[PDB]
């Protein structure tokens, strides 16, 4: 999309591998502000907003908290307390054309600065002189949107840059965006520290003859101790014998 009409995709109800982005060589700019980059695979957020647009090379520095420019004022404003990551990469081989690529626009004129995360797609004629400018364009009546001309022969700073702004926002609704839950190979018949779906403990994990119903995951005895469990990777039932202890 263009930056005056930037696209917004609501990433929710899924699990996000952020370290296929942070370990990607393609991205020229990867700036996480409120959050450490490597800690994204562990933190769980309620939802993510992906705001995608195309700007110039020299306007990438304005996609930042507290920065000020054309893009920050009239196209895309980030709050001062912004948590999230700004990702930008050069797209001169896609968004540039030999005969000009005038499909990408930006708002030049507005009566006031945008509030943070506000979108303004109105193309109405800008009253720049406060004459009776009754809709018709002309003198002191400007079209508010200017076009980025893009050629592939451009230098750096005039080339197109695709920007995706990930804003991880956490309302007190239940969080549904998490990282990949790492798993390791199952070891049986040994006294190991098991962590199965948040249920932790120490025990010997052996094969079990208890046939669970498919909705049930753990097993308890009379004394409310977890003695049976289901492996989440392969749906098999394991008995958790306590590790041997005894008087000497």
């Amino acid at each position, epitope marked *: 999309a263009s930056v005056y009409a930037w696209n917004r995709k609501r990433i929710s109800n899924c699990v996000a591998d952020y370290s296929v982005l942070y370990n990607s060589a393609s991205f020229s700019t990867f700036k996480c502000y409120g959050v450490s980059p490597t800690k994204l695979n562990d933190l769980c957020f309620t939802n993510v907003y992906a705001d995608s647009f195309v700007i110039r090379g*020299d306007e990438v520095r304005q996609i930042a908290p507290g920065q*000020t*420019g054309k893009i920050a*004022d*009239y196209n895309y404003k980030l709050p001062d307390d912004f948590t999230g990551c700004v990702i930008a990469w050069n797209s001169n081989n896609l968004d540039s054309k030999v005969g000009g690529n005038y499909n990408y626009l930006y708002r*030049l*004129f*507005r*009566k*006031s*600065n945008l509030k943070p995360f506000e979108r303004d797609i109105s193309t109405e004629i*800008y*009253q*720049a*002189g*406060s*004459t009776p400018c009754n809709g018709v364009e002309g003198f*002191n009546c*400007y079209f508010p949107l*200017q076009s980025y*001309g893009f*050629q592939p*022969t*451009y*230098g750096v*700073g*005039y080339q197109p840059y695709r920007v995706v702004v990930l804003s991880f926002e956490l309302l007190h609704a239940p969080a549904t965006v998490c990282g990949p839950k790492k798993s390791t190979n199952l070891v049986k018949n040994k006294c190991v520290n098991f962590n199965f779906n948040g249920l932790t403990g120490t025990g010997v994990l052996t094969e079990s003859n208890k046939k669970f119903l498919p909705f049930q995951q753990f097993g308890r005895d009379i004394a409310d101790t977890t003695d049976a469990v289901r492996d989440p990777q392969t749906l098999e039932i394991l008995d958790i014998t306590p590790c041997s202890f005894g008087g000497v």
Partner: antibody
Amino acid sequence: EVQLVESGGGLVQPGGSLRLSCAASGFTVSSNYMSWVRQAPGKGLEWVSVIYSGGSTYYADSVKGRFTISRHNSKNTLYLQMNSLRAEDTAVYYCARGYGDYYFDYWGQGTLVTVSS
Amino acid sequence: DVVMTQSPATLSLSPGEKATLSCRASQSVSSYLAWYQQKPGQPPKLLIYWASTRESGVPDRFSGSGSGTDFTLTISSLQAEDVAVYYCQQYGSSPLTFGGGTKVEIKR
């Protein structure tokens, strides 16, 4: 049909303050990009400052921290408050309406600021 | 900054011949250049913008060409009132810089 009439020039002491005014007639200063441009006597043009249509102000790096561009929106007036004026700030200053911070479509007649003892 | 260099420093031509004025940029501005005319005493007035397009009211003899580093303002037939200083402006980069000017005078 526009006119840009400027006022407020004269002598200041080196280190003094001076407030230049720019009245507009055929357009409104509140919703245009407005700029102050320096021209020293004998030397070419030099951009000093700009205020955006939404109110964002920018300055040249040789003049940052000393000048302040502002507007009065009620009857279309542009102000430049100048502080700590060096002896290299003697020049004719022009206020100009720009189409963005790009090209200056209409200019003011200019006001002469002389900085000497 | 972007240093903008005019050529020549002074141009003295007869009325009616081709006035070619070159302007060179320190780093490439794509089409982000304007040309202004300043008569003595008067403020500058915008002749062309976006390196080619004439501002309204400018005579047809003023025209412009060029891109990248080299730019050119051409007056096809000089008249008597074209004695002025002509400036080129870049505006692609964030510090708006002007050229040093070219003083065009007429022969007689």
